Design an enzyme around this catalytic site. Structure first.
Site, PDB file in Angstrom:
ATOM      1  CB  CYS A   2      -0.913   0.017   1.225  1.00 14.19           C
ATOM      2  SG  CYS A   2      -2.086   1.440   1.280  1.00 14.19           S
ATOM      3  CD  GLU A  38      -6.861   1.884  -4.050  1.00 17.68           C
ATOM      4  OE1 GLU A  38      -6.764   2.630  -3.057  1.00 17.68           O
ATOM      5  OE2 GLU A  38      -5.850   1.401  -4.603  1.00 17.68           O
TER       6      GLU A  38
HETATM    7  C1  LIG Z   1      -2.691  -3.568  -3.503  1.00 19.52           C
HETATM    8  C2  LIG Z   1      -3.161  -2.781  -4.721  1.00 19.52           C
HETATM    9  C3  LIG Z   1      -4.537  -3.258  -5.145  1.00 19.52           C
HETATM   10  C4  LIG Z   1      -3.194  -1.263  -4.478  1.00 19.52           C
HETATM   11  C5  LIG Z   1      -1.823  -0.632  -4.235  1.00 19.52           C
HETATM   12  C6  LIG Z   1      -0.850  -1.104  -5.274  1.00 19.52           C
HETATM   13  O1  LIG Z   1      -1.058  -0.857  -6.455  1.00 19.52           O
HETATM   14  N1  LIG Z   1       0.222  -1.759  -4.834  1.00 19.52           N
HETATM   15  C7  LIG Z   1       0.987  -2.644  -5.709  1.00 19.52           C
HETATM   16  C8  LIG Z   1       0.609  -4.094  -5.469  1.00 19.52           C
HETATM   17  O2  LIG Z   1       0.637  -4.558  -4.343  1.00 19.52           O
HETATM   18  N2  LIG Z   1       0.203  -4.852  -6.490  1.00 19.52           N
HETATM   19  C9  LIG Z   1      -0.217  -6.231  -6.284  1.00 19.52           C
HETATM   20  C10 LIG Z   1       0.128  -4.410  -7.878  1.00 19.52           C
HETATM   21  C11 LIG Z   1       2.486  -2.343  -5.651  1.00 19.52           C
HETATM   22  C12 LIG Z   1       3.004  -2.362  -4.207  1.00 19.52           C
HETATM   23  C13 LIG Z   1       3.273  -3.344  -6.509  1.00 19.52           C
HETATM   24  C14 LIG Z   1       2.804  -0.940  -6.181  1.00 19.52           C
HETATM   25  C15 LIG Z   1      -1.871   0.898  -4.286  1.00 19.52           C
HETATM   26  O3  LIG Z   1      -0.525   1.410  -4.331  1.00 19.52           O
HETATM   27  C16 LIG Z   1      -2.615   1.435  -3.087  1.00 19.52           C
HETATM   28  O4  LIG Z   1      -2.168   1.359  -1.955  1.00 19.52           O
HETATM   29  N3  LIG Z   1      -3.811   1.968  -3.301  1.00 19.52           N
HETATM   30  O5  LIG Z   1      -4.552   2.356  -2.187  1.00 19.52           O
HETATM   31 NI    NI Z   2      -3.623   1.410  -0.349  1.00 18.61          NI
END
Ligand SMILES: CC(C)C[C@@H](C(=O)N[C@H](C(=O)N(C)C)C(C)(C)C)[C@H](O)C(=O)NO
Ligand code: NI
Length: 164
Positions: A90, A133
């Site tokens: 996150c 989200e």
């Molecule tokens: C977990 C994701 C659905 C949302 C988050 C996110 O994209 N993280 C990535 C992730 O874990 N994957 C599985 C794509 C990241 C850590 C690789 C950037 C976002 O950065 C957030 O915190 N939005 O509130």
């Molecule tokens: Ni988040």
């Protein structure tokens, strides 16, 4: 229009978002700032809560090229099915990953950037993103799903980092 993203322990991350009253020019400018903010770092989604805007607004873009803007305003969960779990990171939780249980498939009602109602059925990462989200908008972070002991480990590790 890269907005400041809140990081734990910040209390403002636990605030609950209000419904959006009317999708006017000001709302769209928040939407547009959220995309740019999201685009400045790794990540596929962002809730308004995370930039200290306490209104029910979410932006998502899962495309490699960052050219597929999805906007969820006043989202409502209609249905869900199944279970899944990935190691979520996150933006608001620096340098922590953890598996968290989620529905595998969701159906939601929302308003788009024009204020136009739509419906969306999602699965895979998009389902996970959407729930992640929507959790943010009620002041819920992914760490809340974890044991008090693990929650306290995350909190120790951040008090170490935000210090330096
Ligand atoms: C977990 C994701 C659905 C949302 C988050 C996110 O994209 N993280 C990535 C992730 O874990 N994957 C599985 C794509 C990241 C850590 C690789 C950037 C976002 O950065 C957030 O915190 N939005 O509130
Ligand atoms: Ni988040």
């Amino acid at each position: 229009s890269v907005l400041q993203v809140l990081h734990i322990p910040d209390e403002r991350l636990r605030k609950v978002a209000k419904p959006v009253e009317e999708v006017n020019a000001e709302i769209q400018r928040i939407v547009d700032d959220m995309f740019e903010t999201m685009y400045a770092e790794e990540g596929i989604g962002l809730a308004a809560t995370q930039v200290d805007i306490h209104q029910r607004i979410i932006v998502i873009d899962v495309s490699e090229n960052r050219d597929e803007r999805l906007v969820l305003i006043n989202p409502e969960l209609l249905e869900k099915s199944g279970e899944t779990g990935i190691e979520e990171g996150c933006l608001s939780i620096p340098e922590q990953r953890a598996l968290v249980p989620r529905a595998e498939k969701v159906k939601i009602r929302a308003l788009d950037r024009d204020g136009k109602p739509f419906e969306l059925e999602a699965d895979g990462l998009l389902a996970i993103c959407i729930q992640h989200e929507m959790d943010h908008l009620v002041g819920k972070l992914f760490m809340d799903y974890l044991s008090p002991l693990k929650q306290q480990r995350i909190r120790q590790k951040v008090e170490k980092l935000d210090r330096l």
